[PDB]
Amino acid sequence: SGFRKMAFPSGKVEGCMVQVTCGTTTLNGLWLDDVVYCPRHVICTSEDMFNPNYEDLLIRKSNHNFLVQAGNVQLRVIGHSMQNCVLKLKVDTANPKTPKYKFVRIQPGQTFSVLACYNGSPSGVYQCAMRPNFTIKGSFLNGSCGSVGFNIDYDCVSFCYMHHMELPTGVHAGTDLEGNFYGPFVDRQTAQAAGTDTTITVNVLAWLYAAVINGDRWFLNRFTTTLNDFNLVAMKYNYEPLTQDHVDILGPLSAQTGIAVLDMCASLKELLQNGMNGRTILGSALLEDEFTPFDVVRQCSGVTFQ
Amino acid sequence: SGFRKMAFPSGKVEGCMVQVTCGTTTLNGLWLDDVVYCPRHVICTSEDMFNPNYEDLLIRKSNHNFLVQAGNVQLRVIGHSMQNCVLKLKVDTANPKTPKYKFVRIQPGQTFSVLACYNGSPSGVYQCAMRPNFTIKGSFLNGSCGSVGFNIDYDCVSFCYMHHMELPTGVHAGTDLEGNFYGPFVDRQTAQAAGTDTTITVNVLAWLYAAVINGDRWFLNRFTTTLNDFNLVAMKYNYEPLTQDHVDILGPLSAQTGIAVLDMCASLKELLQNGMNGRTILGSALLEDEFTPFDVVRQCSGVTF
């Protein structure tokens, strides 16, 4: 039994983390084949960041202005290029530890694992979720730029995030591996803020499904509700509106458990209206929204008696 | 900024996970050099898990039935012994991916990362804590036996746990890498009752220091209490007694935040008697006791490996 917020084994990503130094700035880079991917603001100074002209500043830089370090081995940059907000550095030797990979762009509400790195070396791994405001509630410090987010399916590592900056509220923003930011954010020292964040309602119900599988069931009631009568009650507590695809994606869990989707929503309303009465669901006094229904199936397993 | 329940990088441990198949029973092994560590009940069938005479069942076991596989390669076992509750198979090929390692036994209250494996393939990594009742609140399915726990210091992987069994309440019991079970448990799928689980007090205090660093300081009071009067309220709330050795460990955290160790104990006494009044500390309305003082310094400093 048991249920934990679980990350993927970070082995295949550690074999691709290098150290990129341009001038006085040092962040992390992703070494795949003979290319090193890193945030493009590595070429800027603290004064350039207030209004960077990335095309001009990259024109001035040369190949020998980029020190790529794979631990103690110097990596020779034989060409530099740019793609949106990601700098691509061609090197002489291909990474022998390159895994089967693919670049993907996730949707808000999904989950992935972050390998926090500093100076090219890993510090830890945790499980994140792309929030509806296209931010992540990560754990990053100075020098953590270049850290990547990923999901591992079978043997393929689906890279989906590259850290870039932290917002005034302490949350984090980044890009996909093709250089496109998640949200309305830019890599410029300008006034920026995360939008209003809504709770991922489809994830909260999958979390409540995992609790019934794991024995916790005090929140279950005998009453019911309708979708419209639920979609409006949740807006007072700032939850995402439950779409039909959200009710449908909670299907495999509904069959594994035997509690229809509309029945689980009713128990959620009582917990938002009258609180949890000080009790705990899976050891959490709050309602968790960073488990996708796929993560619940991947961990709780469970069978469906067709 | 930010603060997450963060697990160690599992790279140096994945390259050590192999598969061990004896009979129809298959679990995971730990390949270090030319020795494969795994729970000894790989010799047991699912029916012989009630009360097995392991030494007798091992006397009738053979090396050619001991299958060890790393990926596609099959490892040839040249010998086998038994240390307490752990099988030690001797294979021919030394593990080339062997990291600098060490075997340690941890105390109640310490943390470590668990690498859940199935059929020798790692599947997930998460941070866990050795509970005071010597159990762990882990996530294990059928086939997770042999999954190991570990910490990392410098380049040395400090192995400290090996999964063996699941208990009735859902908690899990295991041994160190020398075979000795943690707590009053045995490798027998019988009625084993985990004792009363108390709360790790020093880990909650360290978790409060991380809250002050990350902009959560409403619970900080001006009152002060003694170490004796602090344990008074703790015993009535099922918390471990805070010894002087705990105060000295919280020293570096006390210096960084300019808050006295006992001043934080006064902030904790109010949170125990009066709750938190619908407030959340670091995004949690419950006191988190699975963050050691080192774990707070490790995350808030960006310590790498």
Swiss-Prot record, chain B:
Activity regulation (UniProt): Inhibited by pyridone-containing alpha-ketoamides compounds 13a and 13b. In turn, alpha-ketoamide 13b (tert-butyl (1-((S)-1-(((S)-4-(benzylamino)-3,4-dioxo-1-((S)-2-oxopyrrolidin-3-yl)butan-2-yl)amino)-3-cyclopropyl-1-oxopropan-2-yl)-2-oxo-1,2-dihydropyridin-3-yl)carbamate) inhibits SARS-CoV-2 replication in human lung cells. Inhibited ex vivo by michael acceptor inhibitor N3. Inhibited ex vivo by compound 11a and 11b.
Residues forming the catalytic site: 41 (for 3cl-pro activity), 145 (nucleophile)
Covalent cross-link site, Glycyl lysine isopeptide (Lys-Gly) (interchain with G-Cter in ubiquitin): 5, 90
Impact noted for substituting residue 49 to A: Does not affect ability to cleave and inactivate human TRMT1
Domain Peptidase C30: 1-305
Known outcome of mutating residue 145 to A: Complete loss of 3C-like proteinase nsp5 cleavage
Side Cytoplasmic, residues: 1-305
Catalyses which reaction(s): TSAVLQ-|-SGFRK-NH2 and SGVTFQ-|-GKFKK the two peptides corresponding to the two self-cleavage sites of the SARS 3C-like proteinase are the two most reactive peptide substrates. The enzyme exhibits a strong preference for substrates containing Gln at P1 position and Leu at P2 position
Subcellular location: Host cytoplasm; Host Golgi apparatus; Host nucleus
Function: Cleaves the C-terminus of replicase polyprotein at 11 sites. Recognizes substrates containing the core sequence [ILMVF]-Q-|-[SGACN]. Cleaves and inactivates human TRMT1, preventing tRNA guanine(26)-dimethylation of tRNAs. May cleave human NLRP1 in lung epithelial cells, thereby activating the NLRP1 inflammasome pathway. May cleave human GSDMD, triggering alternative GSDME-mediated epithelial cell death upon activation of the NLRP1 inflammasome, which may enhance the release interleukins 1B, 6, 16 and 18. Also able to bind an ADP-ribose-1''-phosphate (ADRP).
Binding partners and assembly: 3CL-PRO exists as monomer and homodimer. Only the homodimer shows catalytic activity. Interacts with host FBXO22; this interaction promotes the proteasomal degradation of nsp5.
Name of this chain's protein: 3C-like proteinase nsp5
Lineage of the species this protein comes from: Viruses, Riboviria, Orthornavirae, Pisuviricota, Pisoniviricetes
Gene name per UniProt: rep
Residue numbers of the full-length protein present here: 3264 to 3568 of 7096
